[model samples]
Target: MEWWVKKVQDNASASLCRVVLQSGALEMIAEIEACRLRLREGDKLTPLADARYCLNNNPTQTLKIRNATHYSSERWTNADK
Candidate 1:
């Protein structure tokens, strides 16, 4: 499985992103709300717990994003709600 950032938009509280997850069984695009500072176009993604995801570049750890809303497949913060 691989997470790729296709596009990103940071505005107001919803710093949105067009994130793509590519795998053999899954291939979809997710609209995620996150900071544009760390979740850039080239940065990759990895699920942290539930709604949270770890942002990284290559193999170096960068930051994190959470609570994806739009076209997302996550359970929508099942850890909290």
Candidate 2:
């Protein structure tokens, strides 16, 4: 049970600090629903496909690290010691 709890915490932390919400499985699901459906393929009568969205479109670009980790000591600290 600890593993599951830890997993939740991991995801929760990621959501708050990383692009987890912006890059999670919901988008994947919505993508499948849209692409595998039809409307997105230019079919009006084919009905509007549902698309589960992500976090704010204002995503961080190419930082390659989470918000909190971006402030890690290893990054901006003096290493000459």
| Candidate No. with top lDDT | 1
Off by over 4 Å in 1: 12-36, 57-81
Residue 44 miss distance in model 2 (angstroms): 33
**lDDT per model, in order?**
0.49, 0.19
lDDT of 1 by residue, 20-58 (tens): 555444445555553444555665666665445566623
Model 2's C-alpha root-mean-square deviation from the true structure amounts to 17.1
TM-score per prediction, in order, is: 0.43, 0.13
How well does model 2 score by local distance difference test? 0.19
Worst 10 residues of 1 by lDDT: 72-81
Q: Any idea what lDDT model 1 has?
A: 0.49
Candidate 2 residues lying further than 4 Å off, grouped into runs, are: 1-70, 78-81
Across 1-81, the per-residue lDDT of candidate 2 in tens digits comes to: 000000111222222221211121221011011111111121112112242221122222111222222223553242111
